[PDB]
Design a protein around this ligand. Structure first.
Ligand SMILES: *[C@@H]1O[C@H](CO)[C@@H](O[C@@H]2O[C@H](CO)[C@@H](O)[C@H](O)[C@H]2NC(C)=O)[C@H](O)[C@H]1NC(C)=O
Ligand SMILES: *[C@@H]1O[C@H](CO)[C@@H](O)[C@H](O)[C@H]1NC(C)=O
Ligand SMILES: *[C@@H]1O[C@H](CO)[C@@H](O)[C@H](O)[C@H]1NC(C)=O
Ligand SMILES: *[C@@H]1O[C@H](CO)[C@@H](O)[C@H](O)[C@H]1NC(C)=O
Length: 191
């Protein structure tokens, strides 16, 4: 069995002419395709992993909400070779007082401390967005894991080390109050 293999983070990696074709190990009968989308009130990006997989064919799709961050993950496994290229790798309010650091597809090399840009929050969809969030998104499939930082505005200022999970998927981090407080929350603690 031959499967596409590629990784997107969150960029060019699963494009047609960089997708690779690998042959699966003996006993493996499915290719895998996983695309994870994260959407904040200022932008949206996607992670993907295509590769050789395990278990039976099937589908596993879940949409999640962490304090006003939206995630959508799709996981597809099929048994015809080169079949894991079906999924898309693609998806006026007034400002309130607070401004947060925003990483929505910045590299982990690029999203650190005070380096990322600043976005003026706004209560989109009538929910109030006055917290800042520092955290991360991870996707695991085909025995590889891909992860990027996530930063932005959220409907909660008081969450500490929160998360949602989907199949091979986590979105997790911490909240804070005060403009530009999500410079670095890895120290925040606890419960
Ligand atoms: C989301 O991702 C990273 C991992 O890719 C989190 O963890 C840090 O990772 C470094 C190594 O890459 C470790 O040395 C640190 O100890 C980890 N931090 C902690 C607190 O354990 C990163 O911290 C996550 N995001 C947030 C906001 O915590
Ligand atoms: C996503 O899929 C739809 C069909 O389901 C297609 O019309 C659309 O062009 C796709 N998006 C991209 C960016 O290719
Ligand atoms: C949104 O926040 C602003 C603060 O700039 C406030 O005036 C407004 O009432 C808030 N909206 C809701 C629905 O709470
Ligand atoms: C998964 O990847 C790790 C690191 O490359 C490797 O050590 C391990 O053998 C792999 N396992 C499978 C089942 O592919």
């Amino acid at each position: 069995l031959e499967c596409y293999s590629c990784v997107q983070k969150a960029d060019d990696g699963c494009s047609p002419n960089k997708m690779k074709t690998v042959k699966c190990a003996p006993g493996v009968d499915v290719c895998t395709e996983a695309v994870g989308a994260v959407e904040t009130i200022h932008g949206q990006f996607s992670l993907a992993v295509r590769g050789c997989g395990s278990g039976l064919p099937g589908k596993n799709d879940r949409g999640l909400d962490l304090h006003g961050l939206l995630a959508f993950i799709q996981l597809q496994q099929c048994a015809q070779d080169r079949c894991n290229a079906k999924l898309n790798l693609t998806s006026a309010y007034p400002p309130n007082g607070v401004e947060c650091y925003s990483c929505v597809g910045l590299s982990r090399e690029a999203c650190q401390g005070t380096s990322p840009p600043v976005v003026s929050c706004y209560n989109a969809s009538d929910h109030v967005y006055k917290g800042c969030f520092d955290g991360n998104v991870t996707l695991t499939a085909a025995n590889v894991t891909v992860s990027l930082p996530v930063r932005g505005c959220v409907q909660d200022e008081f969450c500490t080390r929160d998360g949602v999970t989907g199949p091979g998927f986590t979105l997790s981090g911490s909240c804070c109050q005060g403009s530009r407080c999500n410079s670095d929350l890895r120290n925040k603690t606890y419960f």
